[PDB]
């Protein structure tokens, strides 16, 4: 696999979004992975609706602003037969009644793939598939106050990941890291991104809940 990978360079990634004060990170991680796979297939990058997922994927197991899973979001898109665009179904940072309208559906999926729980496997998926949805342990002050550099929290756990994010690549500094897109706005970290420690024993559990949709 390549020494460095950055899908942002190829047009697979939308600008950084902001989930605000709502536990919908799983929806932002899911739209991020879908935006990438839809792009790989059609050559068109279209921002997708996190609100649609928040309001309508309860049957699949999600709990709107009180939590969810990226895999549940992917299953919803398949079950539902579509997912609306961000433009057609704006984000409100609060759960509301389902307003899905197939007329504005711009993405879909025929299943999803759960990646083996090894950084090596995550690296191959990132190198061959595109941006990958993952969960990390962001349960620490240091993550909330992060601004720059390779994030490495000594107290990180590879078993209690509590925050869904998107791996858009990986690289090394002149020391290895995963390039991660967060959903906390562009004023957090590096324009909304964080360089998470790579090949440091699955630091913060980055490889333990990695998946992507098949479109
Ligand atoms: N640990 C679990 N399981 N809990 C999940 C909660 C729900 C949701 N995510 C979220 O909600 C994420 C949380 C993320 C990170 C938060 N980090 C911290 O809390 C650590 C920390 C500690 C101290 C200091 C601190 C700072 C300064 C001073 C002092 C102290 C700083 C930082 N949300 C946010 O980032 C948003 C957020 C957080 C707080 C408030 C708020 C508002 C008004 C008043 C007061 C507080 C508003 C918005 C979510 O669903 N996350 C997914 C992540 C995931 C995706 C895919 C696979 C695995 C895991 C999840 O956990 N899914 C499993 C659970 C679930 C399944 C189905 C249905 C529901 C739930």
Question: Ligand 1 pocket check: which of 16, 23, 31 to mutate, most ligand atoms within 8 Å of Cβ?
Answer: 23
Show which residues are catalytic: 25, 163, 182
* Residue 62 alpha carbon to ligand 1 centre in Å: 14
Distances (CA, A) of 128 to 11, 27, 40, 41: 15, 23, 11, 14
77: tokens are: 């898109």
* Residue 163 alpha carbon to ligand 1 centre in Å: 6
Write the residue with the smallest CA distance to atom 48 of ligand 1. Answer: 21
What residues contact residue 47 under an 8 Å CB cut-off, 6+ apart?
14, 31, 35, 85, 86, 87
* Residue 21 alpha carbon to ligand 1 centre in Å: 10
Q: How many alpha carbons lie under 13 Å from residue 135 in its C-beta half-sphere? A: 23
3-state secondary structure the chain: CCCCEEHHHHCCCCCCCECCCCECHHHHHHHHHHHHHHHHHHCCCCCECHHHHHHHCCCCCCCCCECCCHHHHHHHHHHHCCEEECCCCCCCCCCCCCCCCHHHEEECCCCEEECCCCHHHHHHHHHHCCCEEEEECCCCHHHHCCCCCEECCCCCCCCCCCEEEEEEEEEECCCEEEEEECCECCCCCECCEEEEECCCCCHHHCCCCCEEECC
210: tokens are: 């990695």
Resolution in A: 1.8
* Residues 1-215, CATH architecture: Alpha-Beta Complex (3.90)
């Amino acid at each position: 696999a390549p020494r460095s990978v950055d899908w942002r360079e190829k047009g697979y990634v939308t600008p950084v979004k902001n989930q605000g004060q709502c536990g919908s990170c799983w929806a932002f991680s899911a739209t991020g992975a879908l935006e990438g796979q839809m792009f790989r297939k059609t050559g068109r990058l279209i921002s997708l609706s996190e609100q649609n997922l928040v309001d309508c994927s309860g049957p699949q197991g999600n709990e709107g602003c009180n939590g969810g899973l990226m895999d549940y979001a992917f299953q919803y898109v398949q079950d539902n037969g579509g997912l609306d665009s961000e433009e057609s179904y704006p984000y409100e940072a609060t759960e509301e009644s389902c307003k899905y309208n197939p007329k504005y559906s711009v993405a879909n999926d025929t299943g999803f793939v759960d990646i083996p729980k090894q950084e090596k496997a995550l690296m191959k998926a990132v190198a061959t598939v595109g941006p990958i949805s993952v969960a990390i342990d962001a349960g620490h002050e240091s993550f909330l106050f992060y601004k720059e550099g390779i994030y490495f929290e000594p107290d990180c756990s590879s078993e209690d990941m509590d925050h869904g994010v998107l791996v858009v690549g990986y690289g090394f500094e002149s020391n290895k890291y995963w390039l991660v897109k967060n959903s906390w706005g562009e004023e957090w970290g590096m324009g909304g991104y964080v360089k998470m420690a790579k090949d440091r024993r699955n630091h913060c559990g980055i490889a333990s809940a990695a998946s992507y949709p098949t479109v």
